[PDB]
Amino acid sequence: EQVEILRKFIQRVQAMKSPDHNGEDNFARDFMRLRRLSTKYRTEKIYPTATGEKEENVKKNRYKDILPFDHSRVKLTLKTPSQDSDYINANFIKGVYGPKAYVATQGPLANTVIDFWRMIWEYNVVIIVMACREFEMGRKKCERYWPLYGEDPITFAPFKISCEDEQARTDYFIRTLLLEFQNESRRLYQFHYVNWPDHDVPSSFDSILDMISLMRKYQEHEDVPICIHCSAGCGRTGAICAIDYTWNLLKAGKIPEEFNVFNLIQEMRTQRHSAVQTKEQYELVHRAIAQLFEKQLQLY
Incomplete structure (x- = not known):
């Protein structure tokens, strides 16, 4: 029964909050495990990032340490007069049934706004979710690609x-x-x-x-x-x-028995580099999911 699965998950998230013999709660412990595996992935060439490293593409990356895995990168086939390169700093993330359920991408740069639109157009995208401000803490984080209202x-x-x-x-x-x-x-x-x-x-x-x-x-x-x-x-x-x-x-x-968010995030991190970047974000995903499940139970 789904109901039992939801209750068990909620209980498991509660238990994650307690520190172990090393004084670490499960979120801290799990996050360091994901971080270590991602500190590992580039080093053994499991998921190369050759395209992102090409001299012509260096200017198209907002952060030098953040590159798209070649295996899941979003390839741009739409030709424009200004830009013909197939490169954008973006990766597909699979959903419940669609292999291209998400495109995870950086905030575009002044020179890659064109590539952002090429991507949106080619892939028939309707929805954009932007989760940063244009400026944060005195630093530019994303080019404004929409007209002010x-x-x-x-x-x-x-x-x-x-x-x-x-x-x-x-x-x-x-x-x-x-x-x-x-x-x-x-x-x-x-x-x-x-x-x-x-x-x-x-x-x-x-x-x-x-x-x-x-x-x-x-x-x-x-x-x-x-x-x-x-x-x-x-x-x-x-x-x-x-x-x-x-x-x-x-x-x-379709929540599976012993639903495991660590495994979900470990899989997402093989698709887009460092998906869920901090222990606090890792905890937030657990707490938000627990709340969703608490609210679902209210409807039964």
């Missing part, structure tokens, strides 16, 4: 982007964007979460869950990727992916 469309040729609407919710905005290319248009929805600090957690996660739920009313399925990005495309991005994946499994009534 009320302003005229912005050109990143051959793409024209319009801001049609903006809605404010607690801790996030929903922007309705129009993306045009040649004789075609696509309406996009950008969920911009502004109250998650880099390498940190928000004070509460109610609004993270509210945002994921509302985004899933705009696109409930995995038939085309949803694009998730922060600054690096790793920590907050990976946390969102892990919570959304688990919620989708929950909605399908």
Whole structure:
């Protein structure tokens, strides 16, 4: 029974909070295990990052230590007058049934906004989730690729982007964007979460869950990727992916016996480098999932 599985998981997350004989709770212990395995992965060439290292692509990476694994990288086949390279710092992450359920990418740079749009266009993306501010702690974290609400469309040729609407919710905005290319248009929805600090957690996660739920009313399925990005495309991005994946499994009534979030995150980290970047983010994923399950039980 799903019900029993949900209760057991909640109990297991509670137990993770207690320190062991080394004074470490399970989140700290587990995180260091994931970190060590990721400190290991590049070194044994399990998942090369050759494409990201090519001299021409160095300028397309926001952080020198954060590169897309070749095996899961998003390849750009759409030709533009300005850019023909197939490279973007982005990886696919598999969902419950779709192998391209998520694209996890860095916040685009001034020179890679073009590649961001090429990606959104080619992969038929409708949903963008942005989980960083443009500036955080006095540092630029992401190029603004949308027009400010009320302003005229912005050109990143051959793409024209319009801001049609903006809605404010607690801790996030929903922007309705129009993306045009040649004789075609696509309406996009950008969920911009502004109250998650880099390498940190928000004070509460109610609004993270509210945002994921509302985004899933705009696109409930995995038939085309949803694009998730922060600054690096790793920590907050990976946390969102892990919570959304688990919620989708929950909605399908497919939470497995002895459901194991460590294993979920260990798998995600073979797909996008350092997915879920801190022990606090790792704990937040567990606590948010436990809350989802607590709330699901209220409906029975």
